[PDB]
Amino acid sequence: MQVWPIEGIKKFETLSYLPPLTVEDLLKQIEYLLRSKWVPCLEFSKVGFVYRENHRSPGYYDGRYWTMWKLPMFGCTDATQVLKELEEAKKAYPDAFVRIIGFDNVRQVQLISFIAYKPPGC
Amino acid sequence: MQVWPIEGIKKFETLSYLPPLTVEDLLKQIEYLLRSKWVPCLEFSKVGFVYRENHRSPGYYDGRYWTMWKLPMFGCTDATQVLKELEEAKKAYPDAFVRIIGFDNVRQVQLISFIAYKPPGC
Amino acid sequence: VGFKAGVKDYKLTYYTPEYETKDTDILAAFRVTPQPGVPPEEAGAAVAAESSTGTWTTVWTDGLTSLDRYKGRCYHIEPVVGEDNQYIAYVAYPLDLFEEGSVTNMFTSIVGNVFGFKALRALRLEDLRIPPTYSKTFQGPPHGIQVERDKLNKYGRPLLGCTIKPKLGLSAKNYGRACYECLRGGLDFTKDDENVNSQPFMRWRDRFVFCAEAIYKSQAETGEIKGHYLNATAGTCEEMIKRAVFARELGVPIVMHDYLTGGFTANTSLAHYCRDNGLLLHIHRAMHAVIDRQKNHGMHFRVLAKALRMSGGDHIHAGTVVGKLEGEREMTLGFVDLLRDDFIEKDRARGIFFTQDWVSMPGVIPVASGGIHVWHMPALTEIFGDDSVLQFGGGTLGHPWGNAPGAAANRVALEACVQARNEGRDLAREGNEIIRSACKWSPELAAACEIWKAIKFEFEPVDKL
Amino acid sequence: GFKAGVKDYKLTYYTPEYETKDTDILAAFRVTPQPGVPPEEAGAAVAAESSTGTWTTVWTDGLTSLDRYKGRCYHIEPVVGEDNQYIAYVAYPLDLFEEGSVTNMFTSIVGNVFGFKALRALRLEDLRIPPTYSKTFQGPPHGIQVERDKLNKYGRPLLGCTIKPKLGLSAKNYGRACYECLRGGLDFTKDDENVNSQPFMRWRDRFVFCAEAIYKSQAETGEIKGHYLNATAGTCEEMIKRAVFARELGVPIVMHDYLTGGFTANTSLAHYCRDNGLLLHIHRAMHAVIDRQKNHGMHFRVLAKALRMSGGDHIHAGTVVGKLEGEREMTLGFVDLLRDDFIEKDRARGIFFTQDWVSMPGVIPVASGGIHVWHMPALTEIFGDDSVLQFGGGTLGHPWGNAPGAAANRVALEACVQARNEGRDLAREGNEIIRSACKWSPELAAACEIWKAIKFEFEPVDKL
Amino acid sequence: GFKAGVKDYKLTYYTPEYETKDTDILAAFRVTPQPGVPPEEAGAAVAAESSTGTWTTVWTDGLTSLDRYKGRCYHIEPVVGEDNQYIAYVAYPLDLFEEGSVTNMFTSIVGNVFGFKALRALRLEDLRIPPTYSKTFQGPPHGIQVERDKLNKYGRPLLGCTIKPKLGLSAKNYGRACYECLRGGLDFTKDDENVNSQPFMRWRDRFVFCAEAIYKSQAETGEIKGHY
Amino acid sequence: VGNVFGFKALRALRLEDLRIPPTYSKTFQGPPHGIQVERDKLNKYGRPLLGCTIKPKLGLSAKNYGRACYECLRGGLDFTKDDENVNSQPFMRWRDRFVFCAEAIYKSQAETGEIKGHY
Amino acid sequence: ARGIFFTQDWVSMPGVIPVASGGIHVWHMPALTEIFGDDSVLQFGGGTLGHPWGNAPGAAANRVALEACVQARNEGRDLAREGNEIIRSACKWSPELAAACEIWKAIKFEFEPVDKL
Ligand SMILES: O=C(O)[C@@](O)(COP(=O)(O)O)[C@H](O)[C@H](O)COP(=O)(O)O
Ligand SMILES: O=C(O)[C@@](O)(COP(=O)(O)O)[C@H](O)[C@H](O)COP(=O)(O)O
Ligand SMILES: O=C(O)[C@@](O)(COP(=O)(O)O)[C@H](O)[C@H](O)COP(=O)(O)O
Ligand SMILES: [Mg+2]
Ligand SMILES: [Mg+2]
Ligand SMILES: [Mg+2]
Ligand SMILES: [Mg+2]
Missing domain, CATH: 3.30.70.150 (RuBisCO large subunit, N-terminal domain)
Structure with missing residues (x-):
């Protein structure tokens, strides 16, 4: 019988219960996003989690928005390009978490979102 | 005339105003729990006390729940076994407080609860 | 015809x-x-x-x-x-x-x-x-025994309380000072005296403000959840509810009411308010002995006790047996079970004339209070068991070193009795030795034991079975 | 130190x-x-x-x-x-x-x-x-003088009657009984103290039919009528809800059991009645659990003063001659404590302290319980005009029914009042005064025949 | 275990x-x-x-x-x-x-x-x-006995009638139909189960005209009337 | 019909x-929020949401309900829920359950860093 | 063929998230993900509190099973045909999932439906 850990295992939503994603793993999620005809976008933050500082009413949390890296990559057809931008974001903000998202503008919702970089010690 | 201390004497509910429990003291409380036909369970936390972060309405406090170590020891008839699990919990979480509780499932309430381990410096 | x-x-x-x-x-x-x-x-x-x-x-x-x-x-x-x-x-x-x-x-x-x-x-x-x-x-009790222990995270021993004294005459600020010193020494609760409502020497809202400050200061210092029963007893229902509403605003855990002097119509309303607002409700039985003391006429307390479990309260005073107010042992054990248990069979040796089935109505925690002190701790723990509140007003504020040491003496005495009992000692026969043994560890308990060693209340009860 | x-x-x-x-x-x-x-x-x-x-x-x-x-x-x-x-x-x-x-x-x-x-x-x-x-x-919502002024009733004790059987009657039968009693000459009828809201009769139905009965009897007789509708309830919200409907119906009077409901609820109800023009009759149910024995408890005079303070327009104060205990001298003492402005210390009447009410309105004492027409002279002599005399069994037990039973009591009372006013001694001539009225009132004669041998003579448990 | x-x-x-x-x-x-x-x-x-x-x-x-x-x-x-x-x-x-x-x-x-x-x-x-x-x-707000006592009706089944066509009548025609039925001897008429508030007849208008009809039929016959 | x-x-x-x-x-009006809005409020995208009804269906106390809830949410579920027949009953009154389950929701959310709920 | 008798146009009324619940466990994760897709809530009551190690491990088993199914699907694996292999592969990484898989491997609910098109 194993006890689920209580510390050092904070999570980041989808895919965060699997082993760390390799570069090929990240590429395959980006290829899926692109074949599905979704728009990729990178976002980043030095704070990794939600909190409730300004309000505690239903459905209000702070920390859900992270900062947009440049603009969504409209017209992108190459997963490699998305990886290049991820590399530029980590170089610019090595102490920030970086996530990759993908959205469908018809239904207007994000269809995929995962952490692609965590700063050293996080 | 002695002045009751204002610091360094934070408390942990039942038995915390007596001298530190020895291993034999802990064994006797566990034997009492078992002869009374209660179910023992261990719980642990890196935070030792209650606080009020999410709400301040009557009867609401945070920090009352600690984390369950494995599952309650249904069918246990040996105090020694409970001590072995306490040793495993301290080995896994040396920086956590560990408490032993015992419950009666007929009345559905905890009938005994005491701190069995405090981390170094607490 | x-x-x-x-x-x-x-x-x-x-x-x-x-x-x-x-x-x-x-x-x-x-x-x-x-x-x-x-x-x-x-x-x-x-x-x-x-x-x-x-x-x-x-x-x-x-x-x-x-x-x-x-x-x-x-x-x-x-x-x-x-x-x-x-x-x-x-x-x-x-x-x-x-x-x-x-x-x-x-x-x-x-x-x-x-x-x-x-x-x-x-x-x-x-x-x-x-x-x-x-x-x-x-409705019955707003919460009941199990729920109250779960809300306060207190298990394994009687709860400990204390009525502030002098009964009347203290200012709001001095009430909060007395409360803070008592709670920080180890008591779970302090309380307004039954007759402390709102008066020229101390208005209720000022008392509620300073006692809340005291509850939260002692809780922060000790790390244990604390309460001070704030009295909602008042001259009108609108004033009673006004007082309960402000205790709700302050976020405190428990209020009190004198159910017989305020009355059942008001009490039942307050019990519903407390259920709907998460407030534990301590019930004081002021005036009961006007009605229940004599064997030939009146109403026995066990009827008043069943009536309060119906109208609603989380705690009710039930006597001490050994303190300053009368309480014959066997009849007290009988109504303590009527207050706490789900099913109590007829037992005329304990004055239970009828089998009483509560069909899961929550139990009420009996409160032993009145003229008790550290030497009584073994007997009280033996008579009532863990589901009880033991209150020491004079037994805390009368300690020679003040309130926090007086609270510590009672907390140590109680924990020593619980530890001894759990290890298999006979509280009914070894109580004095268990208390003396704890005096080695606690100078505060030793001082209380010295002041009250000769104090016993031994009078023939007026009501006997 | x-x-x-x-x-x-x-x-x-x-x-x-x-x-x-x-x-x-x-x-x-x-x-x-x-x-x-x-x-x-x-x-x-x-x-x-x-x-x-x-x-x-x-x-x-x-x-x-x-x-x-x-x-x-x-x-x-x-x-x-x-x-x-x-x-x-x-x-x-x-x-x-x-x-x-x-x-x-x-x-x-x-x-x-x-x-x-x-x-x-x-x-x-x-x-x-x-x-x-x-x-x-606040004290009484209205008090003796104001109550007489609102009801336009002067010069004699008021007359009431508790409906019976105590429990078990439907709302419609309650109103039927009320109407027949009021139309025969009683000023009031009332819910029994334990009639609140129950499976056999819910309160709101009773309030509707009793209002219908109050207004029908008032229209027929031309005298203001009332039926005390009980606001006593399990919670303060239900008690106020009942008083609010009586207010909507426009009736003159409600009642409350001040000790079983309790003083916190009673004081709230007295304030509501003052603010809404409702007379408040107070029933003292459970008082004898507290006040019967001389060695232990609280004497009723303390409970009486407490009611005059918390508030009520009427309060039961015993009959002396009826089925419940009430020693005469001590009763006269607390009747004065309830009505008068200033009551001097008098140990022969159990008044241990001089009591000064500084214009707090007086409360009308209510004599009720086991009384009948032959008691009318004594009751009039003991209490005087500022009282309500209530005959439940003494009206609904008349052989010809409620309206004749009410007329017998109203005739007996007016014959006593007229005699008293002319200078007759009610204490010595009462039986003759009642027999004389039987010469012209067949209703009174029938009541007198049924109850002539009924007397309640027992040694009181409490003596001064 | x-x-x-x-x-x-x-x-x-x-x-x-x-x-x-x-x-x-x-x-x-x-x-x-x-x-x-x-x-x-x-x-x-x-x-x-x-x-x-x-x-x-x-x-x-x-x-x-x-x-x-x-x-x-x-x-x-x-x-x-x-x-x-x-x-x-x-x-x-x-x-x-x-x-x-x-x-x-x-x-x-x-x-x-x-x-x-x-x-x-x-x-x-x-x-x-x-x-x-x-x-x-709580159960029934009133129950059999109380209902008979409030309406003063004893000794026989009560008589009612659902207005028809089920839907499609205006408020004023609803009240017209109600009045004619009640005045002939029925104790009650009623809205059909699906008559709530609709484009052909809004509820508050129906309630006004049906009250007028209940009281007109009651005044004419002398018997207590109702329309559910 | x-x-x-x-x-x-x-x-x-x-x-x-x-x-x-x-x-x-x-x-x-229809749904108070709907699919898109709910995902946006909870910041959850890219996979089905995961829930869990507490058991036994009836019979658990309020405090044990909150304990079960905390342990489930901290292991990775987004939600737990009252069973359909858990309303307010002698073994567990609703307001007590709401207090302990809120404590559980917030404790598991603080520990995991993911938004949690208990219906 | 799907029992839709009429064309239904919702004119932008928001959608409702369907919830799959009742007697499901880790081995069902591929089929549930394939049937419902991402816009769904999958609920495991007995499938969590019935885990041999308790609730937090039971939750972790389900979360890992679901994430492994999502990752495999996104990489192009056929959930309808490779589900058991995808779940087994995740058992290497997750002792909690391995334990759930062992307890419920023989549990299937196969009965003829009462309502058929
Ligand atoms: O007013 C008092 O005397 C007390 O505050 C006790 O003071 P001490 O702790 O200083 O004695 C209590 O209210 C009584 O115990 C009530 O009696 P009971 O519990 O019998 O109803
Ligand atoms: O319930 C009853 O017995 C009565 O209705 C009287 O009925 P009868 O008129 O039929 O006797 C009264 O409430 C009592 O008088 C109350 O006692 P007291 O006035 O002493 O408080
Ligand atoms: O009560 C139950 O059985 C459940 O809590 C599932 O428990 P398990 O997760 O332990 O099976 C659900 O309410 C059912 O899924 C409802 O059925 P449906 O979804 O078909 O409406
Ligand atoms: Mg006191
Ligand atoms: Mg009566
Ligand atoms: Mg129809
Ligand atoms: Mg369910």
């Missing part, structure tokens, strides 16, 4: 010794002392008639309804052992006679007018069998 | 040299100590534990002034003819009490002292309520 | 020796099991899944007392003349139910069990509502 | 489908 005007004996209609009680009937056991010349059957019939459907002369309107369905009936009379003119008359009342959810209505019928009848010399209601069909119409 | 430990209560709370202040609340306790407890110590324990003291010395007495706040036993006297019994007089400073709260007053004076192990028995006989405290209470 | 995994419901929820308590709510279910499912197991699944149980063993049963709370199938009998059909009787402890809430009672007794794959069909035929539970409900 | 299913002239009747015209559906 025809309506025949005039007077006839109550026993012709209201003494029914062949009646078999129904599981929906409310049953009452009355200790009745008839005037000379009045047969016991007529005394018992008069009590049944005049607490249910009858009056002193025949009325034609009885023919519009069914007395067979509605009359109260005296179905058994038994002489009292040792008395030449006292009887226990048992009366059954149909469920339909009562307003659902109203202790006020139940008492208005059963004890409304019959205690003043000229034909009786004395009358005492000893017990009531409250059927599940009627108790389910009451 | 603070000296921890136990000392006798008398060292601080027995103050025989104390001169009472006009602002103090005074209490007269009949105390029976346990053997071995000196009466001074028993009186001091009662004063201490109903005011500021506890069982051991507390250092916090030093933060305040016990001289200013303590209750104090200032006089003790043995009761002649009793063994080991004393009247202990205790004075409580005005500052000890919450303004406007009978609940708070009782919580201190009778809260815990009756259960002390050192006493065998304790009875509170009387309280001197100072004007400085009574002025903080 | 806690033993994870699936076991048949009948091991815990088929209790043929159980004697029902006067406080229990009893249910009579007409159950048609799938082929291969023993009737005892079908009855036990219905009792379990309408009370305390689920499909696999949970350790949390040990925090409480299933003896106190479980619903239990205490009797099963075949239906004569039907193929593969049984009446299964289930007893539910009083504590399982929210006082005064028919919604809660139905949520347990008929909430999920009618869709179990192991059953082909299920019908709840009757419920024994104990006095301890029914006393927590 | 008000009365026609009981007509003597029928042996059986089942309503299979209804065509709700836009002119009628626009008169309804």
Whole structure:
């Protein structure tokens, strides 16, 4: 019988219960996003989690928005390009978490979102 | 005339105003729990006390729940076994407080609860 | 048959010794002392008639309804052992006679007018069998034993409280100072005295502000959840609710009410408010001994105790046995079980006249308070067990070193008794040795033990079974 | 210096040299100590534990002034003819009490002292309520004069009647009985004290049919009528809900069981009735559980003063001659405490303290229970015009029914009033006055025949 | 000890020796099991899944007392003349139910069990509502006797009439129809069940004209009238 | 479906489908939030959400309900829920359950860093 | 063929998230993900509190199973045909999932539906 850990295992939503994603793993999620005809976008933050500082009413949390890296990559057809931008974001903000998202503008919702970089010690 | 201390004497509910429990003291409380036909369970936390972060309405406090170590020891008839699990919990979480509780499932309430381990410096 | 005007004996209609009680009937056991010349059957019939459907002369309107369905009936009379003119008359009342959810209505019928009848010399209601069909119409305790322990995270030992003293005369700021010092020494609770409401020397809202400050300061210092029962007892229902609303705003865990002096209609309203707002409700039984002290006349406390579990309270005082107020041991154990347990079988050795089934109504925590001190801790722990609150007012604020040391003495004494009991020691026989042994560890307990070693309250109880 | 430990209560709370202040609340306790407890110590324990003291010395007495706040036993006297019994007089400073709260007053004076192990028995006989405290209470919503003025009734006791059987009648039968009684000459009918809302009859249905009956009888007779609709309930919200519907119906009077409902609810209802023009009849159900025995409890005169403070327009005060106990001299004493402005100390009537009400309205005493037409002269002589005389069985038990039963009582009462006014002595000529009215009232003659042999003669349990 | 995994419901929820308590709510279910499912197991699944149980063993049963709370199938009998059909009787402890809430009672007794794959069909035929539970409900606002007393009508059935066509009449025509019916001798008329508030007739307009009709017919006939 | 299913002239009747015209559906509010909004409020994208009904269905105390809830949410579920028949009952009154489950939701959310809920 | 008798136009009324619940466990995760897709809530009551190690491990088993199914699907694996292999592969990484898989490997609910098109 194993006890689920209580510390050092904070999570980041989808895919965060699997082993760390390799570069090929990240590429395959980006290829899926692109074949599905979704728009990729990178976002980043030095704070990794939600909190409730300004309000505690239903459905209000702070920390859900992270900062947009440049603009969504409209017209992108190459997963490699998305990886290049991820590399530029980590170089610019090595102490920030970086996530990759993908959205469908018809239904207007994000269809995929995962952490692609965590700063050293996080 | 002695002045009751204002610091360094934070408390942990039942038995915390007596001298530190020895291993034999802990064994006797566990034997009492078992002869009374209660179910023992261990719980642990890196935070030792209650606080009020999410709400301040009557009867609401945070920090009352600690984390369950494995599952309650249904069918246990040996105090020694409970001590072995306490040793495993301290080995896994040396920086956590560990408490032993015992419950009666007929009345559905905890009938005994005491701190069995405090981390170094607490 | 025809309506025949005039007077006839109550026993012709209201003494029914062949009646078999129904599981929906409310049953009452009355200790009745008839005037000379009045047969016991007529005394018992008069009590049944005049607490249910009858009056002193025949009325034609009885023919519009069914007395067979509605009359109260005296179905058994038994002489009292040792008395030449006292009887226990048992009366059954149909469920339909009562307003659902109203202790006020139940008492208005059963004890409304019959205690003043000229034909009786004395009358005492000893017990009531409250059927599940009627108790389910009451909310009962806002929380109850289990829930209260779960809210406060307190398990494994009696809770410890303390009434601030002097009873009256302290300012709001001094009340909060006394409260903080007591709670920080180890008590779980302090409380307003029963008569501390709002007065020229201390207005309630000021007391509520400073006591909340005190509760939160002591909780932060000790790391244990603390409370101070803030008294909502007031002259009007609007003032009572106003006080409870401000305790809710302050976020505190517990308020109190004097259910008999405020009254059942107000108490029942407050119990509903407390359930709807998460507030534990401590009940003080002020004035009960006006009614329940004498064996020949009045109402035994066990009836008042059942009535409070119905109207609603999370705690109720139940006596100490060993302190300054009377409380015979066996009858106290009997009503302690009526307050806490789900099913209490008839047991005349503990004054339980009827089997009482609460059908999962929550239990109420009995509170032992009044003239107790550290040397009583073993006896109190043995009598009441863990589900109790033991309160030491003079026994804390009378410690020679002040409140925090006085609280620590009581907390240490209690924990030493719990540890000894759990290890298998006999509290009833080794109590003094267990307390002395803890004195080695606690200079605060040693000082309390020295001041009160010669203090005992030994008087013959007025009410005996 | 603070000296921890136990000392006798008398060292601080027995103050025989104390001169009472006009602002103090005074209490007269009949105390029976346990053997071995000196009466001074028993009186001091009662004063201490109903005011500021506890069982051991507390250092916090030093933060305040016990001289200013303590209750104090200032006089003790043995009761002649009793063994080991004393009247202990205790004075409580005005500052000890919450303004406007009978609940708070009782919580201190009778809260815990009756259960002390050192006493065998304790009875509170009387309280001197100072004007400085009574002025903080509303008192009766209306009072005697205003009630007579609203109902246009003068010159005789009012007449009422409790509907019977006590429980078990439907709402529609309740209104039927009410209408027949009121149309025969009674001013009022009433819900029995235990008629609240039950499976056999829910309150709102009863209120609708009784209003219909009040207005039908009033239209037929031309006299203002009322039926006391019971607001007594399990919760304060239900009690107010019932009073609010009586207000909507426009009726003149409601009732409340002040002791079983309780003082906190009663005081709220009295304020609502004052603000909404409703007379408030008060039933004293459960009082005899407290007030019957001489050795222990609280005398009814204390419960009567407490009601005049909390508030009520009528309160039952006994009959003396009916089925429930009521010794004559002590009843005349509390009737004066309920109606008068100033009542002088008079131990022959159990009035231990002079009581000054400083214009608080008086409460109409109600004589009810086991009375009938032959009692009319005595009741008129004992109570006088400012009373309500109620005949439940004495109306619905008439052989010809409710309207004739009501007419018999109204005729008996008016014959007594006319005779009294002419100078006849009701105490000596009452039977002749009733027989003379039977010459022209067949209804009264029928009632007289049924009840001529009925008398309630028992020794009272409480004597002065 | 806690033993994870699936076991048949009948091991815990088929209790043929159980004697029902006067406080229990009893249910009579007409159950048609799938082929291969023993009737005892079908009855036990219905009792379990309408009370305390689920499909696999949970350790949390040990925090409480299933003896106190479980619903239990205490009797099963075949239906004569039907193929593969049984009446299964289930007893539910009083504590399982929210006082005064028919919604809660139905949520347990008929909430999920009618869709179990192991059953082909299920019908709840009757419920024994104990006095301890029914006393927590207000029940009828008035009831038979009070209604007759309020309307002063005794000695015969009351007479009513639903206005027609069911839908499509205007408020004013509704009141016209109501008045003509009541004035001829009916005690009541009524809105059809589907007449609520619609484009052809809004409710408040209907309420105004029907009140006018109730009072006109009452004044003309001298008998108390109503329109639901 | 008000009365026609009981007509003597029928042996059986089942309503299979209804065509709700836009002119009628626009008169309804519909979902308080809907799929997109809910995902946006909870910041959860890219996978089904995961929930869990606490068991035994009935019989657990409020404090044990919150304990079960905390342990489930901290292991990775987005939600736990009251069973459909858990309303307010003698073994567990609703307001006590709401207090302990809120404590559990917030404790598991603080520990995991993911938004949590308990219906 | 899917029992839709009429064309239904919701004119932008928001959608409702369907919830799959009742007797499901880790081995069902691929089929549930394939049937419902991402816009769904999958609930495991007995499938969590019935885990041999308790609630937090039971939750972790389900979360890992679901994430492994999502990752495999996104990479192009056929959930309808490779589900058991995808779940087994995740058992290497998750002792909690391995334990759940062992307890419920033989549990399937296969009965003929009463309502068929
Ligand atoms: O006013 C008092 O005397 C107390 O505050 C105790 O003070 P000490 O702790 O200083 O004695 C309590 O209210 C009594 O215990 C009530 O009696 P009971 O519990 O019998 O109802
Ligand atoms: O319930 C009753 O017995 C009465 O209705 C009288 O009925 P009858 O008129 O038929 O006797 C009264 O409430 C009592 O008078 C109350 O006693 P008291 O006035 O002493 O408080
Ligand atoms: O009560 C139950 O059985 C459940 O809590 C599932 O428990 P498990 O997760 O332990 O099976 C659900 O409410 C059902 O899924 C409802 O059925 P449906 O979803 O078909 O409406
Ligand atoms: Mg007190
Ligand atoms: Mg009466
Ligand atoms: Mg119709
Ligand atoms: Mg469910």
